[PDB]
């Protein structure tokens, strides 16, 4: 008796299990694939690292509290220092990838709360100074695997240099649109009474066949508490949310010396 | 006497043309000429040089 509540995913040398899933999403109905000869652009023989890079890398966990406003990551950025995927990314000018995103959050039959898990193409967010526009530093735009957080307040900085970061305002989805409409993006919900995981399979999405990964993040991953965490015996409690992501059908072009981005 | 041709592909893909005047000079632009062979400028040598062969023996 196969339920869609039990599921296994194997990629490379990594496997994931879940016994309280809620189906899985294939973003825009399309599984990732390699780049066709009839849609190709750069002409050098590409590198397809296969299992070395196409595997489940597991980010640092975050804590969900009743006060938490949300979390965000960008993609290929969250994986930029993850094993061999990171090396292939930075040694090449060009790269493309799909993803299997697995968000993990278990609790108990006596907890309650609901997380919206959204995969957003071209997740451009607002900057935090009103002295300028489109004014975000590369370092703040690309936090890496630690990601960032949403806030329920918008306090743009006076002097232009202090707010070269995202104004991740939760109800405006960090980008001037109401968060309640984020469901037009590929999504699942982790509602603690129903499930403990979300699984999204993402194809490459871009206006090009292949692009510069160190310049450009293709997907944003957003986790918003839609209904806040609550647990009667101790409402100050916290449960972890763990994000595990696997690149898929990775393909790199334009090999040279290694890219080392600035860190300040 | 109307000529019908393919138009340049953009982002019902034919267009009609009728010449209204009695002198060819009056006509609109010549239809795309994809002729080319740069050999007369890039390789105007008397004896054929095979790429994979040495240019000088």
């Amino acid at each position: 008796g196969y339920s869609d509540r039990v599921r296994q995913i194997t990629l490379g040398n990594s496997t994931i299990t879940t016994q309280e899933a809620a189906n899985a999403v294939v973003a825009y109905g399309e599984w990732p694939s390699y780049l066709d000869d009839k849609e190709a652009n750069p002409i050098d023989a590409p590198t397809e690292p296969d299992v070395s890079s196409n595997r489940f890398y597991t980010l640092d966990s975050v804590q969900w509290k009743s006060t938490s406003r949300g979390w965000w990551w960008k993609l290929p950025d969250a994986l930029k220092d993850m094993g061999m995927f990171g090396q292939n990314m930075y040694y090449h000018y060009l790269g493309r990838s799909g993803y299997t995103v697995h968000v993990q959050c278990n609790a108990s039959k006596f907890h309650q709360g609901a997380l919206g898990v959204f995969a957003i193409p071209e997740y451009v967010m607002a900057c935090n100074t009103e002295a300028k526009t489109s004014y975000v530093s590369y370092v703040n735009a690309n936090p890496g695997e630690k990601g960032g957080v949403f806030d329920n307040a918008y306090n743009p900085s006076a002097e232009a240099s202090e707010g070269r970061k995202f104004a991740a305002l939760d109800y405006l989805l960090g980008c001037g649109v109401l968060a309640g409409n984020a469901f037009v993006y590929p999504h699942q919900i982790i509602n603690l009474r129903t499930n403990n995981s979300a699984t999204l399979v993402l194809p490459y999405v871009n206006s090009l066949a292949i692009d510069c990964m160190a310049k450009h993040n293709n997907w944003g991953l957003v986790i918003l508490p839609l209904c806040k965490l609550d647990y009667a015996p101790n409402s100050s409690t916290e449960i972890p949310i763990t994000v595990t992501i696997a690149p898929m059908f990775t393909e790199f072009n334009g090999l040279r010396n290694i890219t080392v981005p600035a860190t300040q | 006497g109307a000529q019908v041709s393919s138009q340049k592909v953009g982002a019902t893909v034919n267009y009609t043309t009728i010449n209204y005047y009695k002198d060819s000079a009056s006509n609109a632009a010549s239809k795309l000429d994809f002729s080319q062979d740069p050999s007369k400028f890039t390789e105007p040598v008397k004896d054929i040089m095979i790429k994979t062969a040495p240019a000088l023996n």
Binding site: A45 | F34, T42, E43, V45, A55, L56
Partner: peptide
């Protein structure tokens, strides 16, 4: 009538040396 496509090639280890020529020829 398009510009040229690129074929799938791999490496070589050959006495055929297309990388070398002699532009003295006028070519």
């Amino acid at each position: 009538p398009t510009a040229q496509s690129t074929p799938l090639t791999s490496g070589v280890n050959s006495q055929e040396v297309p990388a070398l020529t002699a532009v003295e020829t006028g070519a």
